[PDB]
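Box S1 | Example of a co-folding query
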Amino acid sequence: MELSFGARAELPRIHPVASKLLRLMQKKETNLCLSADVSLARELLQLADALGPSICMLKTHVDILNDFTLDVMKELITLAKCHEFLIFEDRAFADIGNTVKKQYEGGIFKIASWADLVNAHVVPGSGVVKGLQEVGLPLHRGCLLIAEMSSTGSLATGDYTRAAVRMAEEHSEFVVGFISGSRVSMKPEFLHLTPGVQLEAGGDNLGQQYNSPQEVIGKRGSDIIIVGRGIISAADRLEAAEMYRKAAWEAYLSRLG
Amino acid sequence: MELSFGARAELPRIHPVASKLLRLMQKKETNLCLSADVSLARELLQLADALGPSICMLKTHVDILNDFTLDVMKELITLAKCHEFLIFEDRAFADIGNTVKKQYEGGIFKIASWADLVNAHVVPGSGVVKGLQEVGLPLHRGCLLIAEMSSTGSLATGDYTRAAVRMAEEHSEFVVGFISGSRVSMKPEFLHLTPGVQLEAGGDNLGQQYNSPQEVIGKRGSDIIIVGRGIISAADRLEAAEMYRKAAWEAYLSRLG
Ligand SMILES: O=c1ccn([C@@H]2O[C@H](COP(=O)(O)O)[C@@H](O)[C@H]2O)c(=O)[nH]1
Ligand SMILES: O=c1ccn([C@@H]2O[C@H](COP(=O)(O)O)[C@@H](O)[C@H]2O)c(=O)[nH]1
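Box S1 (continued) | Returned holo structure for uridine-5'-monophosphate
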Protein backbone atom coordinates (compact mmCIF):
# COMPACT_ATOMS: atom_id res chain seq x y z
CA MET A 1 0.00 0.00 0.00
CA GLU A 2 3.06 2.30 -0.62
CA LEU A 3 2.17 5.77 -1.91
CA SER A 4 4.11 7.93 -4.31
CA PHE A 5 5.69 11.15 -3.07
CA GLY A 6 2.92 13.13 -4.80
CA ALA A 7 0.18 11.09 -3.06
CA ARG A 8 1.94 11.43 0.30
CA ALA A 9 1.92 15.20 -0.27
CA GLU A 10 -1.88 15.06 -0.05
CA LEU A 11 -2.28 12.85 3.09
CA PRO A 12 -4.76 14.26 5.62
CA ARG A 13 -2.14 14.64 8.37
CA ILE A 14 0.68 15.93 6.18
CA HIS A 15 2.56 18.96 7.40
CA PRO A 16 2.66 21.91 4.93
CA VAL A 17 6.45 21.89 4.75
CA ALA A 18 6.48 18.16 4.09
CA SER A 19 3.80 18.55 1.43
CA LYS A 20 5.78 21.30 -0.33
CA LEU A 21 8.86 19.08 -0.29
CA LEU A 22 7.06 15.95 -1.51
CA ARG A 23 5.43 17.89 -4.36
CA LEU A 24 8.76 19.29 -5.62
CA MET A 25 10.39 15.83 -5.26
CA GLN A 26 7.72 14.39 -7.57
CA LYS A 27 7.80 17.33 -10.00
CA LYS A 28 11.59 17.36 -10.35
CA GLU A 29 12.21 13.59 -10.01
CA THR A 30 14.68 14.15 -7.17
CA ASN A 31 15.02 12.70 -3.72
CA LEU A 32 18.57 14.00 -3.29
CA CYS A 33 19.58 16.42 -0.51
CA LEU A 34 22.94 18.09 -1.16
CA SER A 35 25.06 18.37 2.02
CA ALA A 36 26.73 21.65 1.10
CA ASP A 37 29.71 21.16 3.41
CA VAL A 38 31.88 24.07 2.33
CA SER A 39 33.46 26.98 4.17
CA LEU A 40 33.04 29.70 1.55
CA ALA A 41 29.77 31.47 0.83
CA ARG A 42 30.65 31.85 -2.84
CA GLU A 43 31.12 28.13 -3.19
CA LEU A 44 27.86 27.45 -1.30
CA LEU A 45 25.94 29.74 -3.63
CA GLN A 46 27.61 28.48 -6.81
CA LEU A 47 26.78 24.91 -5.81
CA ALA A 48 23.20 25.86 -4.91
CA ASP A 49 22.68 27.52 -8.30
CA ALA A 50 24.27 24.78 -10.44
CA LEU A 51 22.89 21.82 -8.49
CA GLY A 52 19.52 23.35 -7.55
CA PRO A 53 17.65 21.70 -10.43
CA SER A 54 18.96 18.27 -9.32
CA ILE A 55 18.10 18.46 -5.62
CA CYS A 56 15.01 18.53 -3.41
CA MET A 57 16.89 20.05 -0.50
CA LEU A 58 20.15 21.79 0.39
CA LYS A 59 21.53 21.02 3.83
CA THR A 60 23.71 23.57 5.54
CA HIS A 61 26.05 23.75 8.51
CA VAL A 62 26.01 27.58 8.80
CA ASP A 63 28.48 27.36 11.71
CA ILE A 64 31.26 26.23 9.37
CA LEU A 65 30.83 29.09 6.90
CA ASN A 66 33.82 31.34 7.38
CA ASP A 67 32.01 34.29 5.81
CA PHE A 68 28.43 33.81 6.94
CA THR A 69 26.15 36.79 6.79
CA LEU A 70 22.37 37.04 6.73
CA ASP A 71 22.68 38.41 3.21
CA VAL A 72 24.28 35.14 2.12
CA MET A 73 21.21 33.34 3.37
CA LYS A 74 18.96 35.79 1.47
CA GLU A 75 20.83 34.87 -1.70
CA LEU A 76 20.43 31.14 -0.85
CA ILE A 77 16.66 31.64 -0.42
CA THR A 78 16.52 33.29 -3.86
CA LEU A 79 18.13 30.18 -5.34
CA ALA A 80 15.91 27.85 -3.35
CA LYS A 81 12.83 29.63 -4.69
CA CYS A 82 14.16 29.75 -8.28
CA HIS A 83 15.19 26.12 -8.47
CA GLU A 84 12.59 24.79 -5.99
CA PHE A 85 14.36 23.17 -3.08
CA LEU A 86 14.09 23.45 0.71
CA ILE A 87 16.83 24.69 3.01
CA PHE A 88 17.68 22.41 5.92
CA GLU A 89 20.08 23.66 8.63
CA ASP A 90 21.65 20.57 10.23
CA ARG A 91 22.09 22.22 13.63
CA ALA A 92 21.23 19.04 15.56
CA PHE A 93 19.80 20.95 18.52
CA ALA A 94 20.53 19.08 21.68
CA ASP A 95 19.92 21.13 24.81
CA ILE A 96 17.08 22.00 27.14
CA GLY A 97 13.99 23.60 25.62
CA ASN A 98 14.62 27.06 27.01
CA THR A 99 18.08 27.15 25.44
CA VAL A 100 17.30 25.69 22.01
CA LYS A 101 14.51 28.17 21.48
CA LYS A 102 17.09 30.96 21.68
CA GLN A 103 19.67 29.09 19.59
CA TYR A 104 16.97 28.63 16.86
CA GLU A 105 15.60 32.16 16.78
CA GLY A 106 18.49 34.39 17.78
CA GLY A 107 22.16 34.98 17.90
CA ILE A 108 24.09 35.88 14.76
CA PHE A 109 22.62 33.11 12.61
CA LYS A 110 18.89 33.68 13.11
CA ILE A 111 18.35 30.12 11.85
CA ALA A 112 14.56 30.17 11.97
CA SER A 113 14.45 33.24 9.67
CA TRP A 114 15.85 31.29 6.67
CA ALA A 115 15.73 27.51 7.36
CA ASP A 116 12.66 25.63 6.20
CA LEU A 117 13.82 22.65 8.24
CA VAL A 118 16.05 22.07 11.23
CA ASN A 119 16.80 18.91 13.18
CA ALA A 120 17.07 17.97 16.82
CA HIS A 121 18.46 15.15 18.90
CA VAL A 122 15.98 13.43 21.22
CA VAL A 123 18.37 12.84 24.12
CA PRO A 124 17.12 15.87 26.17
CA GLY A 125 13.54 14.57 26.17
CA SER A 126 10.59 16.21 24.49
CA GLY A 127 11.30 19.66 25.85
CA VAL A 128 13.79 20.06 23.04
CA VAL A 129 10.88 19.86 20.59
CA LYS A 130 8.61 22.01 22.73
CA GLY A 131 11.22 24.74 22.85
CA LEU A 132 11.91 24.66 19.15
CA GLN A 133 8.13 24.58 18.42
CA GLU A 134 7.64 27.87 20.19
CA VAL A 135 9.73 29.56 17.52
CA GLY A 136 9.08 27.24 14.59
CA LEU A 137 5.30 27.00 14.65
CA PRO A 138 4.73 30.77 14.29
CA LEU A 139 7.35 30.82 11.56
CA HIS A 140 5.65 27.93 9.69
CA ARG A 141 8.74 25.72 9.90
CA GLY A 142 9.34 22.02 10.27
CA CYS A 143 11.70 19.81 12.23
CA LEU A 144 13.38 16.45 11.80
CA LEU A 145 14.26 14.20 14.79
CA ILE A 146 17.54 12.34 14.79
CA ALA A 147 16.38 8.74 15.28
CA GLU A 148 19.53 6.98 14.01
CA MET A 149 23.04 8.15 13.07
CA SER A 150 25.40 6.89 10.40
CA SER A 151 28.56 6.92 12.47
CA THR A 152 30.42 4.03 14.13
CA GLY A 153 29.38 3.50 17.70
CA SER A 154 26.13 5.44 17.39
CA LEU A 155 23.94 5.05 20.48
CA ALA A 156 20.80 6.04 18.49
CA THR A 157 19.55 2.43 18.37
CA GLY A 158 16.89 0.24 19.92
CA ASP A 159 14.77 2.00 22.53
CA TYR A 160 16.41 5.32 21.74
CA THR A 161 15.20 5.13 18.14
CA ARG A 162 11.76 4.07 19.33
CA ALA A 163 11.66 7.08 21.68
CA ALA A 164 12.48 9.36 18.74
CA VAL A 165 9.62 7.93 16.70
CA ARG A 166 7.17 8.37 19.61
CA MET A 167 8.36 11.96 20.14
CA ALA A 168 7.83 12.75 16.44
CA GLU A 169 4.43 11.20 16.24
CA GLU A 170 3.42 13.18 19.40
CA HIS A 171 4.61 16.53 17.94
CA SER A 172 3.31 16.14 14.39
CA GLU A 173 2.33 19.83 14.15
CA PHE A 174 6.05 20.62 13.91
CA VAL A 175 7.99 17.36 13.41
CA VAL A 176 7.84 16.22 9.76
CA GLY A 177 10.26 13.33 9.80
CA PHE A 178 13.58 11.88 10.75
CA ILE A 179 17.23 11.69 10.20
CA SER A 180 17.63 7.92 10.11
CA GLY A 181 19.36 5.12 8.24
CA SER A 182 16.13 3.35 7.40
CA ARG A 183 12.38 3.69 7.57
CA VAL A 184 11.68 4.02 11.31
CA SER A 185 8.01 5.16 11.27
CA MET A 186 5.25 3.26 9.60
CA LYS A 187 3.25 6.46 9.17
CA PRO A 188 3.63 7.73 5.56
CA GLU A 189 3.25 11.37 6.57
CA PHE A 190 6.78 11.34 7.96
CA LEU A 191 9.87 11.87 5.84
CA HIS A 192 13.01 9.75 6.24
CA LEU A 193 16.29 11.43 5.31
CA THR A 194 19.49 9.38 5.34
CA PRO A 195 23.09 10.63 5.50
CA GLY A 196 26.13 8.36 5.18
CA VAL A 197 25.56 7.76 1.47
CA GLN A 198 28.08 7.14 -1.31
CA LEU A 199 27.99 4.99 -4.44
CA GLU A 200 31.16 3.11 -3.43
CA ALA A 201 31.74 1.21 -0.21
CA GLY A 202 33.78 2.93 2.46
CA GLY A 203 33.82 5.42 5.27
CA ASP A 204 36.00 8.19 6.56
CA ASN A 205 38.74 8.24 9.20
CA LEU A 206 36.46 9.74 11.86
CA GLY A 207 33.70 7.16 12.09
CA GLN A 208 31.53 7.95 9.04
CA GLN A 209 30.14 4.86 7.34
CA TYR A 210 28.67 4.79 3.83
CA ASN A 211 25.89 2.81 2.20
CA SER A 212 24.63 3.14 -1.34
CA PRO A 213 21.45 4.84 -2.53
CA GLN A 214 20.02 1.49 -3.62
CA GLU A 215 20.64 0.08 -0.16
CA VAL A 216 19.25 3.12 1.73
CA ILE A 217 16.23 3.91 -0.41
CA GLY A 218 15.52 0.49 -1.89
CA LYS A 219 16.28 -1.99 0.85
CA ARG A 220 16.04 0.18 3.98
CA GLY A 221 13.01 2.12 2.83
CA SER A 222 14.22 5.71 3.36
CA ASP A 223 12.96 8.63 1.25
CA ILE A 224 15.83 10.99 0.71
CA ILE A 225 19.59 10.57 0.50
CA ILE A 226 21.84 13.19 2.02
CA VAL A 227 25.20 13.34 0.20
CA GLY A 228 28.18 15.53 1.02
CA ARG A 229 31.71 14.51 -0.02
CA GLY A 230 30.49 12.05 -2.67
CA ILE A 231 29.41 15.14 -4.54
CA ILE A 232 31.46 18.02 -3.09
CA SER A 233 34.89 16.36 -3.48
CA ALA A 234 34.18 15.30 -7.10
CA ALA A 235 35.63 17.38 -9.91
CA ASP A 236 32.29 17.83 -11.69
CA ARG A 237 29.78 18.28 -8.88
CA LEU A 238 26.87 18.66 -11.29
CA GLU A 239 27.44 15.28 -12.89
CA ALA A 240 28.06 13.75 -9.43
CA ALA A 241 24.73 15.16 -8.21
CA GLU A 242 23.01 13.74 -11.27
CA MET A 243 24.47 10.31 -10.62
CA TYR A 244 23.17 10.41 -7.03
CA ARG A 245 19.79 11.79 -8.12
CA LYS A 246 19.30 9.07 -10.68
CA ALA A 247 20.38 6.33 -8.21
CA ALA A 248 18.05 7.52 -5.44
CA TRP A 249 15.12 8.15 -7.79
CA GLU A 250 15.26 4.72 -9.47
CA ALA A 251 15.61 3.00 -6.09
CA TYR A 252 12.44 4.82 -5.03
CA LEU A 253 10.55 3.88 -8.21
CA SER A 254 11.52 0.26 -7.95
CA ARG A 255 10.28 0.08 -4.35
CA LEU A 256 6.96 1.54 -5.54
CA GLY A 257 6.70 -1.11 -8.26
CA MET B 1 39.53 8.06 50.37
CA GLU B 2 38.02 11.31 48.89
CA LEU B 3 40.61 13.92 47.88
CA SER B 4 40.32 17.67 48.03
CA PHE B 5 40.20 19.66 44.81
CA GLY B 6 43.82 20.74 45.39
CA ALA B 7 44.98 17.10 45.80
CA ARG B 8 43.01 16.05 42.72
CA ALA B 9 44.85 18.79 40.81
CA GLU B 10 48.07 16.83 41.39
CA LEU B 11 46.86 13.29 40.43
CA PRO B 12 49.23 11.49 38.05
CA ARG B 13 46.64 11.21 35.26
CA ILE B 14 45.15 14.68 35.64
CA HIS B 15 44.69 16.71 32.50
CA PRO B 16 46.37 20.18 32.54
CA VAL B 17 43.09 22.01 32.04
CA ALA B 18 41.48 20.05 34.85
CA SER B 19 44.45 20.73 37.11
CA LYS B 20 44.29 24.48 36.40
CA LEU B 21 40.58 24.44 37.21
CA LEU B 22 40.93 22.38 40.41
CA ARG B 23 43.73 24.64 41.66
CA LEU B 24 41.69 27.84 41.18
CA MET B 25 38.62 26.16 42.76
CA GLN B 26 40.69 25.46 45.89
CA LYS B 27 42.39 28.88 45.91
CA LYS B 28 39.16 30.84 45.50
CA GLU B 29 36.83 28.51 47.47
CA THR B 30 34.44 28.25 44.53
CA ASN B 31 32.88 25.33 42.73
CA LEU B 32 30.31 27.51 40.98
CA CYS B 33 30.05 27.79 37.18
CA LEU B 34 27.99 30.79 36.05
CA SER B 35 25.72 29.97 33.08
CA ALA B 36 25.92 33.39 31.46
CA ASP B 37 22.70 33.00 29.48
CA VAL B 38 22.33 36.52 28.12
CA SER B 39 21.96 37.95 24.63
CA LEU B 40 24.02 41.12 25.02
CA ALA B 41 27.81 41.21 25.04
CA ARG B 42 27.85 44.12 27.45
CA GLU B 43 25.80 42.18 29.96
CA LEU B 44 28.01 39.09 29.50
CA LEU B 45 31.13 41.12 30.19
CA GLN B 46 29.65 43.06 33.11
CA LEU B 47 28.57 39.78 34.71
CA ALA B 48 31.97 38.19 34.06
CA ASP B 49 33.77 41.11 35.70
CA ALA B 50 31.50 41.42 38.76
CA LEU B 51 31.02 37.70 39.35
CA GLY B 52 34.49 36.55 38.26
CA PRO B 53 35.87 36.43 41.82
CA SER B 54 32.96 34.16 42.87
CA ILE B 55 33.16 31.58 40.07
CA CYS B 56 35.51 28.84 38.87
CA MET B 57 34.05 28.87 35.38
CA LEU B 58 31.86 30.91 33.05
CA LYS B 59 29.70 28.91 30.67
CA THR B 60 28.67 30.48 27.39
CA HIS B 61 26.20 29.81 24.60
CA VAL B 62 27.93 32.05 22.01
CA ASP B 63 25.17 31.23 19.50
CA ILE B 64 22.63 33.24 21.51
CA LEU B 65 24.75 36.40 21.69
CA ASN B 66 23.08 38.90 19.41
CA ASP B 67 26.28 40.93 19.10
CA PHE B 68 28.99 38.29 19.15
CA THR B 69 32.36 39.24 17.81
CA LEU B 70 35.79 37.70 18.35
CA ASP B 71 36.75 40.90 20.14
CA VAL B 72 34.05 40.22 22.73
CA MET B 73 35.69 36.90 23.42
CA LYS B 74 39.11 38.61 23.75
CA GLU B 75 37.60 40.85 26.41
CA LEU B 76 36.10 37.76 28.15
CA ILE B 77 39.54 36.09 28.16
CA THR B 78 41.01 39.21 29.79
CA LEU B 79 38.44 38.89 32.58
CA ALA B 80 38.97 35.15 32.88
CA LYS B 81 42.70 35.71 33.34
CA CYS B 82 42.22 38.62 35.78
CA HIS B 83 39.70 36.90 38.00
CA GLU B 84 40.92 33.32 37.38
CA PHE B 85 38.14 31.29 35.85
CA LEU B 86 37.85 29.00 32.83
CA ILE B 87 35.62 29.62 29.83
CA PHE B 88 33.33 26.74 28.87
CA GLU B 89 31.34 26.96 25.60
CA ASP B 90 28.27 24.71 26.03
CA ARG B 91 28.06 23.85 22.34
CA ALA B 92 27.02 20.24 22.98
CA PHE B 93 28.63 18.96 19.77
CA ALA B 94 26.59 16.14 18.40
CA ASP B 95 27.52 15.22 14.83
CA ILE B 96 29.99 13.04 13.01
CA GLY B 97 33.68 13.58 13.71
CA ASN B 98 34.47 15.21 10.39
CA THR B 99 31.77 17.82 10.93
CA VAL B 100 32.37 18.66 14.60
CA LYS B 101 36.03 19.30 13.95
CA LYS B 102 35.03 22.14 11.62
CA GLN B 103 32.27 23.42 13.92
CA TYR B 104 34.90 23.59 16.76
CA GLU B 105 37.72 25.26 14.87
CA GLY B 106 36.04 27.38 12.22
CA GLY B 107 33.09 29.35 11.13
CA ILE B 108 32.37 32.76 12.64
CA PHE B 109 32.75 31.66 16.26
CA LYS B 110 36.19 30.01 16.16
CA ILE B 111 35.24 28.28 19.44
CA ALA B 112 38.55 26.50 19.97
CA SER B 113 40.45 29.83 19.84
CA TRP B 114 38.86 31.09 23.10
CA ALA B 115 37.11 28.21 24.94
CA ASP B 116 39.14 26.33 27.53
CA LEU B 117 36.41 23.69 27.62
CA VAL B 118 33.68 22.48 25.30
CA ASN B 119 31.24 19.61 25.65
CA ALA B 120 29.94 16.87 23.40
CA HIS B 121 27.08 14.41 23.32
CA VAL B 122 28.06 10.74 23.04
CA VAL B 123 25.20 9.67 20.77
CA PRO B 124 27.32 9.75 17.55
CA GLY B 125 29.84 7.29 18.97
CA SER B 126 33.46 8.03 19.75
CA GLY B 127 34.18 9.70 16.44
CA VAL B 128 32.68 12.84 17.91
CA VAL B 129 35.55 12.90 20.42
CA LYS B 130 38.14 11.91 17.84
CA GLY B 131 37.10 14.77 15.60
CA LEU B 132 37.10 17.33 18.36
CA GLN B 133 40.48 16.00 19.62
CA GLU B 134 42.11 16.77 16.31
CA VAL B 135 41.52 20.46 16.94
CA GLY B 136 41.54 20.50 20.74
CA LEU B 137 44.71 18.59 21.49
CA PRO B 138 46.99 20.95 19.53
CA LEU B 139 45.21 23.88 21.13
CA HIS B 140 45.70 22.41 24.64
CA ARG B 141 41.95 22.29 25.32
CA GLY B 142 39.68 19.98 27.24
CA CYS B 143 36.26 18.44 26.70
CA LEU B 144 33.33 17.33 28.82
CA LEU B 145 31.02 14.44 27.77
CA ILE B 146 27.31 14.76 28.36
CA ALA B 147 26.59 11.63 30.43
CA GLU B 148 23.26 12.74 31.95
CA MET B 149 20.90 15.67 31.33
CA SER B 150 18.72 17.61 33.75
CA SER B 151 15.62 17.79 31.59
CA THR B 152 12.39 15.77 31.79
CA GLY B 153 12.44 12.73 29.57
CA SER B 154 16.22 12.68 29.17
CA LEU B 155 17.41 9.51 27.43
CA ALA B 156 20.94 9.94 28.89
CA THR B 157 20.41 7.15 31.43
CA GLY B 158 21.45 3.58 32.07
CA ASP B 159 23.66 2.11 29.35
CA TYR B 160 23.88 5.46 27.61
CA THR B 161 25.48 7.01 30.69
CA ARG B 162 27.79 4.03 31.03
CA ALA B 163 28.84 4.45 27.38
CA ALA B 164 29.68 8.10 28.07
CA VAL B 165 31.87 7.15 31.02
CA ARG B 166 33.71 4.50 28.95
CA MET B 167 34.22 7.00 26.10
CA ALA B 168 35.68 9.56 28.53
CA GLU B 169 37.97 7.14 30.24
CA GLU B 170 39.22 5.98 26.77
CA HIS B 171 39.96 9.56 25.60
CA SER B 172 41.53 10.92 28.78
CA GLU B 173 44.11 12.98 26.84
CA PHE B 174 41.27 15.33 25.89
CA VAL B 175 38.17 14.45 27.96
CA VAL B 176 38.42 15.92 31.48
CA GLY B 177 34.98 15.16 32.82
CA PHE B 178 31.26 15.17 32.43
CA ILE B 179 28.08 17.06 32.33
CA SER B 180 26.02 14.89 34.67
CA GLY B 181 23.56 15.06 37.54
CA SER B 182 25.71 12.98 39.84
CA ARG B 183 29.11 11.38 40.14
CA VAL B 184 29.22 8.95 37.21
CA SER B 185 32.95 8.01 37.16
CA MET B 186 34.78 6.57 40.10
CA LYS B 187 38.06 7.97 38.79
CA PRO B 188 38.94 11.20 40.69
CA GLU B 189 40.76 12.71 37.73
CA PHE B 190 37.43 13.44 36.07
CA LEU B 191 35.34 16.51 36.83
CA HIS B 192 31.57 16.35 37.30
CA LEU B 193 29.63 19.49 36.40
CA THR B 194 25.89 19.63 37.09
CA PRO B 195 23.30 21.98 35.57
CA GLY B 196 19.67 22.12 36.69
CA VAL B 197 20.53 23.78 40.00
CA GLN B 198 18.54 26.26 42.07
CA LEU B 199 18.17 26.80 45.82
CA GLU B 200 14.37 26.42 45.66
CA ALA B 201 12.44 23.47 44.28
CA GLY B 202 10.98 23.85 40.82
CA GLY B 203 11.60 23.71 37.12
CA ASP B 204 10.73 25.67 34.03
CA ASN B 205 7.91 25.32 31.51
CA LEU B 206 10.12 23.57 28.94
CA GLY B 207 11.32 20.52 30.85
CA GLN B 208 14.10 21.93 33.06
CA GLN B 209 14.20 20.38 36.52
CA TYR B 210 16.05 21.85 39.50
CA ASN B 211 17.85 20.33 42.46
CA SER B 212 19.72 22.16 45.18
CA PRO B 213 23.47 22.53 45.59
CA GLN B 214 23.38 20.41 48.74
CA GLU B 215 21.60 17.65 46.87
CA VAL B 216 23.87 17.78 43.78
CA ILE B 217 27.24 18.23 45.45
CA GLY B 218 26.55 16.64 48.83
CA LYS B 219 24.28 13.72 48.14
CA ARG B 220 24.94 13.04 44.44
CA GLY B 221 28.66 13.61 44.64
CA SER B 222 29.16 16.11 41.80
CA ASP B 223 31.96 18.71 41.81
CA ILE B 224 30.63 21.86 40.27
CA ILE B 225 27.19 23.44 40.03
CA ILE B 226 26.16 25.19 36.86
CA VAL B 227 23.61 27.95 37.57
CA GLY B 228 21.88 30.21 35.07
CA ARG B 229 18.51 31.81 35.88
CA GLY B 230 18.91 31.34 39.65
CA ILE B 231 21.59 33.97 39.35
CA ILE B 232 20.86 35.84 36.09
CA SER B 233 17.18 36.59 36.83
CA ALA B 234 17.95 37.84 40.37
CA ALA B 235 18.12 41.58 40.98
CA ASP B 236 21.54 41.44 42.65
CA ARG B 237 23.45 38.83 40.65
CA LEU B 238 26.59 39.24 42.76
CA GLU B 239 24.82 38.34 45.99
CA ALA B 240 22.98 35.50 44.18
CA ALA B 241 26.32 34.12 42.95
CA GLU B 242 27.70 34.33 46.47
CA MET B 243 24.74 32.41 47.85
CA TYR B 244 25.30 29.65 45.27
CA ARG B 245 29.07 29.66 45.83
CA LYS B 246 28.70 29.29 49.56
CA ALA B 247 26.08 26.51 49.19
CA ALA B 248 28.17 24.48 46.74
CA TRP B 249 31.43 25.00 48.65
CA GLU B 250 30.03 23.93 52.04
CA ALA B 251 28.34 20.89 50.46
CA TYR B 252 31.76 19.94 49.07
CA LEU B 253 33.53 20.46 52.41
CA SER B 254 30.99 18.43 54.29
CA ARG B 255 31.36 15.51 51.87
CA LEU B 256 35.13 15.67 52.45
CA GLY B 257 34.62 15.55 56.22
O1 LIG C 1 23.98 10.59 11.30
C1 LIG C 1 24.40 11.63 10.72
C2 LIG C 1 23.93 12.90 10.94
C3 LIG C 1 24.41 13.96 10.21
N1 LIG C 1 25.37 13.81 9.18
C4 LIG C 1 25.73 14.89 8.33
O2 LIG C 1 25.51 14.53 6.96
C5 LIG C 1 26.65 14.95 6.18
C6 LIG C 1 27.36 13.68 5.67
O3 LIG C 1 28.33 14.17 4.74
P1 LIG C 1 29.29 13.19 3.87
O4 LIG C 1 29.78 12.12 4.79
O5 LIG C 1 28.41 12.60 2.78
O6 LIG C 1 30.31 14.13 3.35
C7 LIG C 1 27.54 15.78 7.11
O7 LIG C 1 27.19 17.17 7.01
C8 LIG C 1 27.19 15.28 8.48
O8 LIG C 1 27.35 16.28 9.46
C9 LIG C 1 25.81 12.50 9.01
O9 LIG C 1 26.71 12.24 8.16
N2 LIG C 1 25.38 11.48 9.73
O1 LIG D 1 21.50 18.76 31.00
C1 LIG D 1 21.71 19.97 30.73
C2 LIG D 1 22.66 20.43 29.85
C3 LIG D 1 22.85 21.78 29.67
N1 LIG D 1 22.13 22.76 30.39
C4 LIG D 1 22.45 24.14 30.30
O2 LIG D 1 22.72 24.66 31.61
C5 LIG D 1 22.05 25.94 31.75
C6 LIG D 1 20.94 25.77 32.80
O3 LIG D 1 20.48 27.10 33.04
P1 LIG D 1 19.35 27.45 34.14
O4 LIG D 1 18.26 26.42 34.02
O5 LIG D 1 20.03 27.35 35.50
O6 LIG D 1 18.97 28.84 33.79
C7 LIG D 1 21.49 26.29 30.37
O7 LIG D 1 22.45 27.08 29.64
C8 LIG D 1 21.33 24.97 29.69
O8 LIG D 1 21.48 25.06 28.29
C9 LIG D 1 21.17 22.23 31.25
O9 LIG D 1 20.42 23.00 31.91
N2 LIG D 1 20.96 20.94 31.41
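Chain B has one domain: 1-257. Strands of chain B lie at 32-35, 57-60, 86-93, 117-121, 142-146, 175-179, 191-194, 224-227.
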